[PDB]
Symmetry: none
Subunit: 84 residues, 2 copies
């Protein structure tokens, strides 16, 4: 479809297609990770743990909330996460 | 009639996409080719494009549909080596 967002892992930023927009925050989160994984490389025992997604505010998005209800098309969103 | 501009440094090239249903990697093939022509650097000259960004720095994944990840007439920056 049309609906899309960018997600900041640290300084690296990743565009995720959300077709609908009707996807739950937790679905989004995984989708963001997959792409980030691809963008960043590549260590044999790598791992990433996402704690939460936010607005630039620090406004915290509930995991079970529909995306288009909690954000707008083409919003920048930050991930609070760990990795390596 | 979907289309995008790709930025190779300061040179901007316009690529047609049909409907925009082509992958982000297809785009890159299209853009390299066109950019080669527009500056015609060398018979030997080699080029590698690492990633495609939006203005913000928003990476576009290679296996994603273009019209899904970008908008008609968007301006995109190529991150590349030459």
């Amino acid at each position: 479809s049309e609906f899309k967002v960018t997600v900041c892992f640290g300084r690296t930023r990743v565009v995720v297609p959300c077709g609908d927009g009707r996807m739950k925050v937790f679905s989004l989160i995984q989708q963001a990770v997959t792409r980030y994984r691809k963008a960043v490389a590549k260590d044999p025992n790598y791992w990433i743990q996402v704690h939460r997604l936010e607005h630039g505010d620090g406004g915290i998005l509930d995991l079970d909330d529909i995306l288009c209800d909690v954000a707008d098309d083409k919003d920048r969103l930050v991930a609070v996460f760990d990795e390596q």
